[PDB]
């Protein structure tokens, strides 16, 4: 109903990310919360190790609690309680580490800047749900992880179909004519 | 705007395509806009205008599941698994033929500057790409605006690259208009307190993330006015075109 | 104090190009062709190991060829190599650190890796499977608008070569700081009429095929990569099992499955910190340890 | 114990050309013209097995077909074949299994296995079923720049010559460790005047046609592997069964359906394992071993 989950994931290892770098190496452990993405409609992600989690009896999975009615926000405006919100958010602790990150120089006027570009979640789940009723094939596909992805995100598990990637290629210049 | 410097049917090999996470094909425009700063610092001009080409480019592989490379043990974690299936680190690559057409100012000499330059491009690289067969650079003169479309009958055929604006947001706008996406640049999110690791001990350290942005690639001669193809460096690290939004 | 340093990174110093493929005759090397690839079917039965039951069910299957065509007996495999200098100078990371192994090096002779570059790239160990059947082996090698021809043969039983010595020499002077030389690598081959032709292969996700072929604008070539291994394959710096392999840090290839420079004491980074907190060592591995640097890279972890 | 290595690759040793085809006459073989593939439809019932019911509808199609023209009636099917000898080495691993597994062998007599190859390229076995209702048949096979010509009948049931005798001791030399031996072959045929041939067919995904054909630039042709089934067919090797089949682990024919050298005490992994370790082999075992080894494929695993 409404707490066996919570502690669930409090008990075991889980933690809460938007943008990390495992899609590029799979030996980095940095991760950290960005206050800007809270909103209704924005996409988070987690992580618990061996990626277990936990089955219903009934039968439920994960991606439908996110999006039936959205309970935790209806107890976020205050209708039950308060102490839920800063007991789920205490679980929340950022780590930083940058070794084996890409490094940008980047000019600005006059000046330099360094900048480690980094993926988001969202995107990929927008545009993959979004193309996927449209019936659109001009996309790559790829999988993670390979000999044993499982281990490594639940995408390359259990939806099949596969992400989407935008085919950025530029026609050719047809030879032997004017144009 | 005095001097033009041209070089065509530059061949590059083994391109990385991976541009982010989730863009994959065509280099973004931030790559071009380090090496001209880094040609600026280098050779000591400053460089207002940057223009590019595409006449070749072919990804390696299929329609999906393009091109996968097969990395090697090398970390110092090894020594009894390392006889067997290397970790694959999937990571494709890709081959191009392009062009570049550079403005440049200098009285001192005229052909010193296609001297460095040329020597310059000779030890580079294009997003992780090699430099395999380029044509001579050759040199244009241009005086003010009106003549200006004599350079566009100097150095044809090509295709061009043109903002067409977006509406409110992007991620429906790219599958109704059915353009292609590209990077204009960089936003600023946290600083990055840590200098352990950086390259260097002074630059400053922030974490930022890519800002997407509309273009379109066409004929030079649909395109009307010419000033929708120049690049602009703007405010907040972003990159503007000089005639706006497009119109008929 | 003096901890190894994690992040560290070196360029390319060798630059191969992509290789490409032409069909040419003999005697009438003006006119040449390119190579196509095509696509066949195969028909063939299950050669499962511990399956006897299996043996009576047929196999259709569609995959890529390559071959000379049918009036045509010469093979012509051109590209390009760059080396470059600036050695010893980081690319990512590393201030202070790289002057330090700096003031131990530069008593090793570069000389020697020139000459097995030259000479990997002259008697033809970057055609792998091209040579099997071939009479007749030569190439032609344009440098500085200089140009040498070359018969060599008899990768077995290195002996000592003057006729290659001024490549090599000049090149060894490049790596040792100085800007970019570039090779134009044209090899000639006489393998037969109508054989077959071995470009390099690439693997993809179950597809229609299961051969594909490296194609460039429909014409069959070859990945930097495999050239790239097989200029780098100089490692005759241990006491046995010649015929040498490529260079790398826990250097042992997979293709075979071999487990060479174990952690038995020869390493890379073993050696340069008992260097420095103790004797030296012989000249053998100053040797090994830079010429696995000159190529270029990241290390660390 | 010596268990069998995770991979074991051999690669093949008789490599054919890709086979082509033109039409001749019958005594000016000077000049030739090639053989188009084309392309025309067909109509017919459709007549199956206990299927009374829908035999009311007429099925159409479109096929591909082949023929001579109308003013000639000779067929020429031309190739060359490549006897590569150096064997008893894996191309893929194998330091200790092969070698000892090589020790074993060479005891064997290599001139029997290339008799029986020269006899099959002579008789014209390795030419398909285009050979029904010929009248007069003949092989010109060059070798060294020496001609021989053939009129040989028996394709079957292996006779005794003088004219393969030279040839067959040359392929044994060349075969017991040694470089490489070439032949070109002119098969010359006589259907008749306006009689069809039978190429290779393809079997893609659902398109237009529906019985493909082989062409290289629109040139009917064959495979260089159904040459090659067609030349390794010498296994008279078991209890029964003359008129021989091919060498292949687990001897079998999906045509015929029926799987010899199953798992009754003989077979190639069974006999490699004996060879390896254990007590020698007989004659004919021995010989059988060794020229499966000449065909190339993967084993362990």
Same mark, same amino acid.
């Given at each position: 109903?409404?707490?066996?989950?919570?502690?669930?994931?409090?008990?075991?290892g889980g933690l809460i990310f938007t943008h990390s770098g495992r899609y590029t190496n799979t030996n980095n452990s940095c991760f950290?919360?960005?206050?800007?993405?809270?909103?209704?409609?924005?996409?988070?992600?987690?992580?618990?190790?061996?990626?277990?989690?936990?089955?219903?009896?009934?039968?439920?999975?994960?991606?439908?609690?996110?999006?039936?009615?959205?309970?935790? #926000?209806?107890? #976020?405006?205050?209708?039950?309680?308060?102490?839920?919100?800063?007991?789920?958010?205490?679980?929340?602790?950022?780590?930083?580490?940058?070794?084996?990150?890409?490094?940008?120089?980047?000019?600005?006027?006059?000046? #330099?800047?360094?900048?480690?570009?980094?993926?988001?979640?969202?995107?990929?789940?927008?545009?993959?749900?979004?193309?996927?009723?449209?019936?659109? #094939?001009?996309?790559?596909?790829?999988?993670?992880?390979?000999?044993?992805?499982?281990?490594?995100?639940?995408?390359?598990?259990?939806?099949?179909?596969?992400?989407?990637?935008?085919?950025?290629?530029?026609?050719?210049?047809?030879?032997?004519?004017?144009? | 705007?005095?001097?033009?410097?041209?070089?065509?049917?530059?061949?590059?090999?083994?391109?990385?395509?991976?541009?982010?996470?989730?863009?994959?094909?065509?280099?973004?425009?931030?790559?071009?806009?380090?090496?001209?700063?880094?040609?600026?610092?280098?050779?000591?001009?400053?460089?207002?205008?940057?223009?590019?080409?595409?006449? %070749?480019?072919?990804?390696?592989?299929?329609?999906?599941?393009?091109?996968?490379?097969?990395?090697?043990?090398?970390?110092?974690?090894?020594?009894?698994?390392?006889?067997?299936?290397?970790?694959?680190?999937?990571?494709?690559?890709?081959?191009?033929?392009?062009?570049?057409?550079?403005?440049?100012?200098?009285?001192?000499?005229?052909?010193?500057?296609?001297?460095?330059?040329?020597?310059?491009?000779?030890?580079?690289?294009?997003?992780?790409?090699?430099?395999?067969?380029?044509?001579?650079?050759?040199?244009?003169?241009?005086?003010?605006?009106?003549?200006?479309?004599?350079? %566009?009958?100097?150095?044809?055929? =090509?295709?061009?690259?043109?903002? =067409?604006?977006?509406?409110?947001?992007?991620?429906?706008?790219?599958?109704?208009?059915?353009?292609?996406?590209?990077?204009?640049?960089?936003?600023?999110?946290?600083?990055?307190?840590?200098?352990?690791?950086?390259?260097?001990?002074?630059?400053?350290?922030?974490?930022?993330?890519?800002?997407?942005?509309?273009?379109?690639?066409?004929?030079?001669?649909?395109?009307?006015?010419?000033?929708?193809?120049?690049?602009?460096?703007?405010?907040?690290?972003?990159?503007?075109?000089?005639?706006?939004?497009?119109?008929? | 104090?003096?901890?190894?340093?994690?992040?560290?990174?070196?360029?390319?110093?060798?630059?191969?190009?992509?290789?490409?493929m032409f069909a040419v005759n003999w005697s009438d090397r003006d006119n040449t062709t390119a190579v196509m690839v095509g696509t066949?079917?195969?028909?063939?039965? *299950?050669?499962?190991?511990?399956?006897?039951?299996?043996?009576?069910?047929?196999?259709? *299957?569609?995959?890529?060829?390559?071959?000379?065509?049918?009036? +045509?007996?010469?093979?012509?495999?051109?590209?390009?190599?760059?080396?470059? !200098?600036?050695? /010893?100078?980081?690319?990512?990371?590393?201030?202070?650190?790289?002057?330090?192994?700096?003031?131990?090096?530069?008593?090793?002779? /570069? !000389?020697?890796?020139?000459?097995?570059?030259?000479?990997?790239?002259?008697?033809?160990?970057?055609?792998?499977?091209?040579?099997?059947?071939?009479?007749?082996?030569?190439?032609?090698?344009?440098?500085?608008?200089?140009?040498?021809?070359?018969?060599?043969?008899?990768?077995?039983?290195?002996?000592?070569?003057?006729?290659?010595?001024?490549?090599?020499?000049?090149?060894?002077?490049?790596?040792?700081? $100085?800007?970019?030389?570039?090779?134009?690598?044209?090899?000639?081959?006489?393998?037969?009429? !109508?054989?077959?032709?071995?470009?390099?292969? $690439?693997?993809? $996700?179950?597809?229609?095929?299961?051969? *594909?072929?490296?194609?460039?604008?429909? *014409?069959?070539?070859?990945?930097?990569? +495999?050239?790239?291994?097989?200029?780098?394959?100089?490692?005759?710096?241990?006491?046995?099992?010649?015929?040498?392999?490529?260079?790398?840090?826990?250097?042992?290839?997979?293709?075979n499955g071999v487990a060479y420079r174990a952690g038995n004491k020869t390493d890379l980074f073993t050696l340069m910190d008992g260097?420095?907190?103790?004797?030296?060592?012989?000249? $053998?591995?100053?040797?090994?340890?830079?010429?696995?640097?000159?190529?270029?890279?990241? /290390? !660390?972890?």
């Amino acid at each position: 109903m409404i707490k066996e989950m919570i502690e669930d994931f409090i008990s075991k290892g889980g933690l809460i990310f938007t943008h990390s770098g495992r899609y590029t190496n799979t030996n980095n452990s940095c991760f950290i919360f960005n206050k800007n993405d809270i909103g209704v409609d924005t996409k988070v992600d987690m992580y618990t190790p061996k990626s277990a989690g936990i089955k219903n009896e009934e039968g439920e999975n994960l991606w439908q609690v996110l999006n039936k009615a959205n309970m935790f #926000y209806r107890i #976020y405006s205050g209708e039950l309680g308060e102490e839920l919100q800063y007991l789920l958010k205490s679980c929340c602790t950022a780590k930083e580490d940058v070794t084996t990150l890409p490094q940008i120089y980047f000019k600005n006027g006059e000046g #330099y800047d360094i900048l480690v570009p980094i993926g988001n979640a969202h995107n990929l789940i927008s545009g993959t749900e979004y193309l996927w009723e449209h019936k659109y #094939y001009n996309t790559f596909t790829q999988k993670l992880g390979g000999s044993n992805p499982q281990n490594c995100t639940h995408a390359c598990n259990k939806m099949r179909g596969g992400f989407k990637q935008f085919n950025c290629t530029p026609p050719q210049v047809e030879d032997n004519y004017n144009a | 705007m005095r001097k033009f410097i041209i070089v065509k049917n530059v061949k590059v090999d083994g391109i990385n395509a991976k541009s982010s996470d989730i863009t994959v094909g065509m280099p973004p425009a931030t790559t071009f806009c380090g090496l001209g700063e880094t040609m600026s610092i280098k050779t000591g001009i400053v460089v207002k205008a940057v223009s590019y080409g595409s006449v %070749k480019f072919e990804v390696r592989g299929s329609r999906f599941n393009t091109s996968v490379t097969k990395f090697a043990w090398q970390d110092r974690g090894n020594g009894g698994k390392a006889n067997n299936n290397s970790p694959i680190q999937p990571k494709p690559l890709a081959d191009g033929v392009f062009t570049l057409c550079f403005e440049v100012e200098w009285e001192d000499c005229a052909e010193v500057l296609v001297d460095k330059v040329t020597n310059f491009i000779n030890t580079a690289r294009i997003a992780g790409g090699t430099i395999a067969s380029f044509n001579k650079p050759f040199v244009k003169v241009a005086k003010d605006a009106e003549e200006l479309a004599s350079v %566009k009958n100097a150095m044809m055929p =090509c295709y061009v690259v043109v903002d =067409c604006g977006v509406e409110v947001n992007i991620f429906e706008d790219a599958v109704n208009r059915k353009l292609q996406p590209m990077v204009n640049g960089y936003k600023k999110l946290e600083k990055i307190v840590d200098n352990k690791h950086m390259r260097d001990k002074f630059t400053p350290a922030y974490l930022a993330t890519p800002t997407y942005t509309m273009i379109g690639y066409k004929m030079v001669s649909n395109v009307d006015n010419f000033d929708q193809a120049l690049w602009q460096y703007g405010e907040n690290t972003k990159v503007k075109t000089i005639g706006g939004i497009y119109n008929d | 104090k003096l901890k190894a340093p994690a992040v560290l990174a070196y360029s390319r110093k060798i630059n191969p190009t992509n290789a490409l493929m032409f069909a040419v005759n003999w005697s009438d090397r003006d006119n040449t062709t390119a190579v196509m690839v095509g696509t066949k079917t195969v028909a063939g039965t *299950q050669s499962v190991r511990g399956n006897p039951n299996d043996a009576d069910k047929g196999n259709i *299957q569609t995959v890529n060829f390559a071959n000379l065509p049918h009036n +045509k007996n010469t093979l012509l495999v051109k590209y390009n190599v760059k080396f470059v !200098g600036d050695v /010893f100078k980081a690319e990512l990371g590393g201030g202070e650190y790289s002057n330090t192994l700096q003031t131990a090096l530069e008593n090793t002779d /570069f !000389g020697t890796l020139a000459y097995r570059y030259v000479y990997n790239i002259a008697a033809g160990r970057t055609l792998w499977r091209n040579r099997v059947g071939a009479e007749s082996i030569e190439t032609v090698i344009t440098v500085n608008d200089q140009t040498f021809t070359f018969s060599d043969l008899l990768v077995n039983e290195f002996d000592e070569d003057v006729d290659v010595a001024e490549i090599a020499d000049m090149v060894a002077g490049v790596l040792s700081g $100085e800007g970019f030389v570039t090779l134009k690598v044209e090899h000639y081959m006489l393998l037969g009429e !109508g054989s077959e032709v071995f470009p390099s292969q $690439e693997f993809v $996700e179950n597809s229609k095929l299961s051969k *594909q072929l490296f194609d460039l604008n429909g *014409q069959a070539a070859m990945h930097d990569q +495999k050239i790239g291994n097989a200029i780098r394959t100089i490692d005759t710096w241990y006491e046995d099992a010649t015929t040498p392999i490529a260079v790398e840090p826990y250097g042992s290839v997979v293709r075979n499955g071999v487990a060479y420079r174990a952690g038995n004491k020869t390493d890379l980074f073993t050696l340069m910190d008992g260097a420095v907190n103790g004797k030296s060592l012989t000249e $053998e591995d100053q040797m090994f340890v830079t010429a696995n640097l000159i190529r270029g890279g990241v /290390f !660390g972890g």
